[PDB]
């Protein structure tokens, strides 16, 4: 039989956690200020052993089996500031001992999460806490909040109620917490919010509920201080009227049923608005059309996500509409046309349009965006123009004039012919033309990209020959030519900066040191699996296999 | 109808709903502790009982029903001595004390089905089940048509109401008789009782200790 | 849940709501000769998703039998018991007697 594992003692810090203790130790020093009894088999907290440590300020009794609480247990700890009873059997504590938890004059943070607490039993257990600042009742079985639920804790400013079964909240339920600033109601069974009267509240989490309708009180005596509202994964059918929240900065409406573009049909209930908004997530909804009045109100908005919606047209044609919009995500919609007016989205750096149905567009749609950098048109069957000469036949989208664009993706665009002046004056650093079977690169199609290009990808194009002079791309670092029929590459006479070279699944037989003389110093990884290599016929590939190459 | 739904989010909610669904049907505030579990494989009697339920053949229906089975008294235990087996009826008697042990109160019973292992039927036949109502008389029950099969098959007859009467006001030994159908124009392993009932440990009418 | 109660309280829970449909008064139709009306009724009430915990108070478990009995990802208050409605109406000059399936709702369940 092994002797007991002792507690790890530090200066006024005693750690008895995960020692399999059945009872609170009584041989601990009286001057202890921090005690950690988590992860043991404590089934009750009596006042007799614990009361000897009057200097305690931080007491953690979490993740035990505590079901009994002696009425005077914690009152002896006159200096106690943090108490953690999380993950215990405290639901039956009131049935075993009367009075519940006692007064806690100095406790600032209390954790009662994961105790299977019930409505009524919670009100019996909770005691007066004048100094309480953080309270956690998460992972319990609370079905409702009454006007007499959170009493005698006026200093409370953070309340965590996530992972409960809350369904009903009485009108004056939070009247006793005027200083409340953070309220978390995530993972609950709320279905409809008729009122919002928390003036001093700043952060509100209503995610993962069934809230079909959300409505705030209108024209308050003072402006509501809410700046962070979360309504994701609900059943919202409408965009909330947030004109009663002037200071709101964050709003996540992702994963709802919102249509643009108040009634609660499942329940049967019916009863510059966002000039300060910064981040708005409307992704995963059922928005089919965007009203003209909707975008105009969203000034100073920096991020707008509309991915995974039923949108078919997006036109920001109003003068100066969405000026500060740094990012616009319209990916995976049914977008057939989009009208980005000139001098409209002036501060737009990222435009995500992959997974749409764009075909014909005005030639200078993306050219009017002043500070456009990232542009993703994957799976959009777009046809670039020839730039200065050989004007594109029909609605060719011009990529030649965007001097600020850096990264462009034309993957899965069924591009048949890449015309010569496609990017003559677009200093791209990355360009992805992969997944375009039958692509015909015209002579000099990568016109002005010799100086700027660093990443190039042509995977899956089935190319039998590469029409671009790769050695003159002095800044190119990563080149992807995988899944093609290429057999020969232009000779590298002078040293270049190419580091990664992917030639997997091609028709390469010989890679001679004549055509690979350059980039011997800069090459680091050379992918070549899937080629009909002539064994010992080339030579340079074997000598490079040692230093400065990969498999 | 316009496309916007990803099954990945739905699956996670369906899984989490199953977590509470099983716990609520079993009336478990928390998963039971595995401390007192005896080491080794499950007993053959328990595994055989679990195989009997999986075999193919009111508010309270949400909650789980405890499963027990009681085999009929052996054929050589006064069944063949006092009760003659004709060309039609086969007599299957059950110990009422053994039934009352598996189901302490008649109200707890939710379903009881007699199960038979048919030997082999190459030709269709119509059969009828009967209950020993009086000391000599037989009460008519359900009838079923047996499809031809070259292999043995298990048959099940719902006898929930009869077993409930046996639990309350039953004799020392009752049983059923299974005879072939006789139209007025015509003058001519072992079976067990599968029981489904509410456990006393989870009975609503008893206050928790 | 008692039907006599369901149709006698304004409570936001799943239940059968009383609704009688008069062809003349409610729909303005006179082409349905028989009957003059019927108790169609309807289901109404939230079936809130319950986020399940491994540990849970014993009495809270009853919520799953009512709010989400099937453990669906998005439970709905849908009818359970349904009854046909036979009618008599004229099509041109020939009278026709036809029975419409699943017209009267007698009980509602979360699904």
């Amino acid at each position: 039989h092994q002797d007991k594992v002792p507690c790890k003692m530090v200066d006024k810090k005693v750690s008895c956690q995960v020692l399999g203790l059945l009872q609170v130790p009584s041989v601990l020093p009286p001057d202890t200020e921090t005690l950690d009894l988590s992860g043991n088999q404590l089934r009750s907290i009596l006042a007799s052993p614990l009361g000897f440590y009057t200097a305690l300020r931080h007491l953690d009794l979490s993740t035990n089996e505590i079901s009994f609480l002696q009425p005077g247990a914690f009152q002896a700890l006159t200096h106690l500031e943090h108490l953690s009873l999380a993950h215990n059997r405290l639901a039956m504590a009131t049935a075993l001992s009367a009075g519940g938890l006692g007064p806690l004059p100095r406790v600032t943070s209390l954790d009662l999460s994961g105790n299977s607490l019930y409505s009524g039993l919670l009100e019996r257990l909770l005691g007066e806490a004048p100094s309480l600042h953080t309270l956690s009742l998460a992972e319990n079985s609370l079905t409702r909040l009454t006007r007499h639920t959170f009493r005698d804790m006026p200093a409370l400013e953070q309340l965590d109620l996530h992972s409960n079964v809350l369904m009903d909240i009485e009108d004056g339920a939070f009247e006793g917490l005027p200083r409340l600033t953070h309220l978390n109601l995530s993972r609950n069974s709320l279905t409809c919010i008729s009122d919002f009267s928390l003036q001093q509240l700043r952060v509100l989490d209503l995610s993962c509920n069934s809230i079909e309708a959300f409505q705030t009180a209108s024209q308050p005596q003072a402006e509501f201080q809410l700046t962070w509202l979360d309504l994701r994964e609900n059943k919202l059918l409408h965009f909330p009227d947030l004109a009663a929240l002037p200071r709101l900065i964050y709003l996540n409406l992702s994963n709802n049923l919102i249509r643009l573009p108040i009634h609660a049909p499942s329940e049967g209930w019916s009863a510059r608005p966002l000039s300060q908004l910064l981040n708005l997530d409307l992704s995963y909804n059922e928005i089919e059309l965007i009203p003209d009045s909707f975008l105009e109100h969203l000034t100073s908005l920096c991020f707008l996500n509309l991915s995974r919606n039923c949108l078919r047209t997006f036109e920001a044609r109003r003068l100066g509409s969405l000026p500060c919009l740094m990012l616009l995500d319209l990916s995976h919609n049914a977008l057939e046309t989009l009208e980005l007016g000139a001098r409209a989205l002036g501060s737009l750096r990222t435009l995500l349009l992959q997974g749409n149905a764009l075909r014909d567009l005005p030639p200078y749609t993306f050219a009017n965006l002043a500070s456009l950098q990232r542009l993703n048109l994957q799976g959009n069957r777009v046809s670039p123009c020839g730039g200065p000469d050989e004007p594109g036949p029909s609605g060719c989208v011009a990529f030649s004039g965007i001097t600020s664009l850096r990264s462009l993706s034309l993957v899965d665009n069924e591009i048949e012919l890449l015309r010569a002046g496609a990017f003559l004056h677009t200093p791209l650093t990355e360009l992805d033309l992969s997944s375009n079977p039958g692509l015909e690169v015209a002579t000099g199609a990568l016109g002005g990209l010799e100086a700027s290009l660093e990443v190039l990808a042509l995977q899956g194009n089935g190319l039998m020959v590469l029409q671009v002079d790769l050695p003159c791309f002095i800044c190119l670092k990563r080149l992807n030519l995988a899944e093609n029929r290429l057999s020969h590459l232009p000779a590298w006479t002078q040293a270049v900066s190419l580091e990664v070279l992917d030639l997997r699944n091609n028709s390469f037989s010989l890679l001679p040191g004549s055509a690979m003389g350059g980039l011997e110093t800069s090459l680091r990884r050379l992918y070549l699996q899937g080629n009909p290599l002539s064994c010992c016929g080339n030579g340079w590939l074997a000598a490079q296999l040692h230093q400065g190459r990969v498999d | 109808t316009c496309k916007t739904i990803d099954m990945e989010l739905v699956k996670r909610k369906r899984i989490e709903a199953i977590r509470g669904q099983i716990l609520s049907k079993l009336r478990l505030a928390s998963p039971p502790s595995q401390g007192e579990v005896p080491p080794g494989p499950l007993p053959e009697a328990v595994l055989a009982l679990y195989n009997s339920t999986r075999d193919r053949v009111p508010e309270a229906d949400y909650y789980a029903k405890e499963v027990t089975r009681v085999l009929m008294v052996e054929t050589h235990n006064e069944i063949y001595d006092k009760f003659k087996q004709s060309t039609h009826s086969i007599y299957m008697f059950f110990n009422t004390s053994e039934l009352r042990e598996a189901v302490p109160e008649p109200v707890l019973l939710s379903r009881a089905e007699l199960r038979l292992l048919r030997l082999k039927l190459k030709v269709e036949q119509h059969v009828e089940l009967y209950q020993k109502y009086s000391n000599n008389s037989w009460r008519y029950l359900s009838n079923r048509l047996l499809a031809p099969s070259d292999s043995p098959e298990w048959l099940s007859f719902d006898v929930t109401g009869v077993v409930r009467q046996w639990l309350s006001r039953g004799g020392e030994i009752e049983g059923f008789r299974l005879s072939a159908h006789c139209s007025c124009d015509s003058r001519d392993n072992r079976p067990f009782l599968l029981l489904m009932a509410t456990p006393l440990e989870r009975a609503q009418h008893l206050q928790s200790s | 849940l008692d039907t006599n109660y369901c149709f006698s309280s304004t409570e936001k829970n799943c239940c059968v709501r009383q609704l009688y449909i008069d062809f003349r008064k409610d729909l303005g139709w006179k082409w349905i000769h028989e009957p003059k009306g019927y108790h169609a009724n309807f289901c109404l009430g939230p079936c809130p998703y319950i986020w399940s915990l491994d540990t849970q108070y014993s009495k809270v478990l009853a919520l799953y039998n009512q709010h989400n009995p099937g453990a669906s990802a998005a439970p709905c208050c849908v009818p359970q018991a349904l009854e046909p409605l036979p009618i008599v109406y004229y099509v041109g000059r020939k009278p026709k007697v036809e029975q419409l399936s699943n017209m009267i709702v007698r009980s509602c369940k979360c699904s």
Partner: antibody, heavy 121, light 108 residues
Framework: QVQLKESGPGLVAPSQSLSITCTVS????????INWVRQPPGKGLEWLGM???????DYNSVLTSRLRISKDNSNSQVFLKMNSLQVDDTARYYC???????????????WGQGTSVTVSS | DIQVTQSSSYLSVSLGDRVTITCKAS??????LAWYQQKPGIAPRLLVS???SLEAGVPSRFSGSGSGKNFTLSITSLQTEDVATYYC?????????FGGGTTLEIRR
Amino acid sequence: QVQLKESGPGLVAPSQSLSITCTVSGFSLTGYGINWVRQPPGKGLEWLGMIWSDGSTDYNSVLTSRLRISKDNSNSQVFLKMNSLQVDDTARYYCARDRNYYDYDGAMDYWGQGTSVTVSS
Amino acid sequence: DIQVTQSSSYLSVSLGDRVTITCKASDHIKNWLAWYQQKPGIAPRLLVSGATSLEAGVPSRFSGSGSGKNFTLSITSLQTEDVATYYCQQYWSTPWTFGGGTTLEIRR
């Protein structure tokens, strides 16, 4: 409005069981608890037990085999059973609805008119 | 169990005078206590739920007070309709327990 009405046999023979049914209206039994309180002809209320909205039951400390409360939510009925009544069991038996302010409350707000139970044979 | 007791089974008082009914609990139930009124022939009616909160429809003349173990139901000015027996019932923990009652009587 809200109503509770008891249904008793009136007379009970000694050593015989007592059965009382508490019919309710205006509220669902799935969301409200029903207490059973009896009052003898002499002064004093005596709580017998209650059936919680989920069907769980708590009883008075002297209950052994003499108390059993069930209900039928679909029919808005609560059933009380009492075995082997004696002379001292002659009393008026009420059923009171629980004030469901909390899920675990206990305060009784709506009482039935009560039923007289006499054990005399 | 939590026993609850009413020391005075009878309390003499005249009309228009102040009346106070005491009811003590065996342990600190902290507010979880109710007050009931029962006419000699009528069924009991809830007067005070919690230690202080008056039920809807109760006259303002009645009032409750107390916390922990000691409690009291006060009547500001006694009326003829208040001549009845009063009970207290704790609900801190099951089983719910009643008091012995306090029947009011007119002094003479």
